[PDB]
Chain length 256, copies 3
């Protein structure tokens, strides 16, 4: 399809969604929400895609949101619209997703990055939750996902003060998978996406789903769910080919 | 008037300074009741938007009065629900800052973890040495420490009683920031001032949403936050904050 | 007893379980699972044991599993056996366990290490979750314990790419307790075990159980659990002696 705020690219088994509002420093709005989730969902249902990247510009992954949509928003309209709920569709994506974050990832932007499974950051990446300064708070999962990544003391710090966090701090805290030089961000993200998309598709979906369990229940239930999923893998051809390949000292030819 | 603490107000920030220097600010029952009383009074004061808790340069709080526990029987502890009063600190709705220098050991460390924001001096030494006394943490240590720095390190700290310096606390998830010892009180006031200057309802909601991350599934935490966020739009502070932003000025809440 | 795939030694109040499959880099398999859990269980019930070390060789804590064993498994075989469930027995051990990890700890090996309470890593340690490459996923708690230790973005990365993590990253990410020089792994692990085993046995077991609570319920419930366990500690002679010793400024003499 054609979109207005994003560009969508397919190369091999990798899909890439590039936020495209340069005049706004890739600020999120309701239209961006709708377009990204439509794109991501459409990519998720494509058998020829095994990984999805979401990225912005070198200057901004996403520097926040259009204040106009929130400025004269009333509680009635927010409640009626369930304002931001549509973002949940990105989390419902079963194929692995990778946020490639360069420069500014602030408010909504940082929240969008955290929605992704894998987070590769440029060395220029700046994260933060400055929503408090506008007299509000995170509304796209920030108080949940940030706190679960970096712990209470830092989560409370960023959310109550709005201070920024650079890439190196993001990396030692739990917020990002790894950090790479800014000129190599897109190349690294593609390489990570490539590797992931060459794994067995069900095994990757299963592995991602199992990790996601770790934030939804007791440890004891997470362990049970994982083990059962693990057992199910043995009904898949790819488990059989994967192990055979290992033993026979050769490359696995996955069928998906 | 208090015996074991000093309480001070300035603008919209309140400071509770632990005041038992002859005993390294070691916690006891009086300290528990006074700190929690002062914090609760500050929480109900609408002229207060942030609360600092700190000790001295040498020790935030080093352990506790052991004679208060030595001869306790199970029946005594159960009847008294020993340490339950500390729960009043976590119920404080206004943001709290632990400004930790020097020794934060046992209860001292647990008191620091109860606060929302933790600013440590470079001299801060954290530890859970309760095991050495033949008991364990009883003020949230096994729960808050583990959730901050992970199982491997919490197990290490709680079972060997080894201490952890400010740098390790910072890379592990225990403190928000580390600052030079001479700047601790200054920096915490700066952080407190900043928080106290935000919308009171907005910061209470933010804090409360963050606390949810430890009480339920992510699924439920996400829904709660989104509902809280929705409700913020029924506040006048929200209209002010966004209007102040457009006009590139400071909000007048 | 005597074992085929492991070695067991006892000194003072510390027990050591050494993985012993050098021909296969200590790769896990059903026998290792059964023997390791049997040994741990026996050490757990020995009153004269206060700490338990699990370790491998300097080249590998445990590099992967016998893929040969899982290769021809159908879903039915895995379902019937409840494949890997027996590992649960290790975490049911009440005495503190310490994983001393040198070299390779990949897949099941990394999962094994994470099951332990304390993890001492040699600077040569290499952690990974490469299960995905075989067209499966972590089956021994990897997706669960790794995620809880290092956070979502890093666990996703490891589990979805199979990349390795060195001891230094592991230490700053939350995965390990401490990193020491390779030549001193065993020495330092035994010092840590000696310290833990010299604590009150009951107090150590309680603190360990309290800590485990932090992954099984909400924070409010974990708080109440720990306070009540704390209350009951006052019914132990060790509480009474340990506090008396501290107050009397003398060394404690436990039971």
């Amino acid at each position: 399809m054609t979109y207005e705020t994003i560009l969508v690219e397919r190369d091999q088994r990798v899909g890439i969604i590039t936020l495209n509002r340069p005049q706004a420093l890739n600020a999120l709005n309701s239209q961006v929400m709708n377009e990204v989730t439509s794109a991501a969902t459409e990519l998720d249902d494509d058998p020829d895609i095994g990984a999805i990247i979401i990225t912005g510009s070198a200057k901004a992954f996403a520097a926040g949101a259009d204040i106009k949509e929130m400025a004269d928003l009333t509680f009635a309209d927010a409640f009626t619209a369930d304002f931001f709920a549509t973002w949940g569709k990105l989390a419902a994506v079963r194929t692995p997703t990778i946020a490639a974050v360069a420069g500014y990832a602030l408010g909504g932007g940082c929240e969008l990055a955290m929605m992704c499974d894998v987070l590769i950051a440029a060395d220029t990446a700046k994260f933060g939750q400055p929503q408090i300064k506008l007299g509000v708070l995170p509304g796209m999962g920030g108080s949940q996902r940030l706190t679960r990544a970096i712990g209470k003391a830092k989560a409370m710090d960023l959310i109550l003060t709005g201070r920024t966090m650079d890439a190196a701090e993001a990396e030692r805290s739990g917020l990002v998978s790894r950090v790479v030089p800014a000129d190599d961000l897109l190349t690294e993200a593609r390489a990570t996406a490539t590797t992931i998309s060459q794994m067995s598709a069900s095994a990757a979906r299963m592995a991602k789903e199992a990790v996601n369990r770790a934030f939804e229940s007791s440890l004891s239930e997470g362990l049970l769910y994982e083990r059962r999923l693990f057992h199910s893998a043995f009904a898949t051809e790819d488990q059989s080919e994967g192990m055979a390949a290992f033993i026979e000292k050769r490359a696995p030819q996955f069928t998906h």
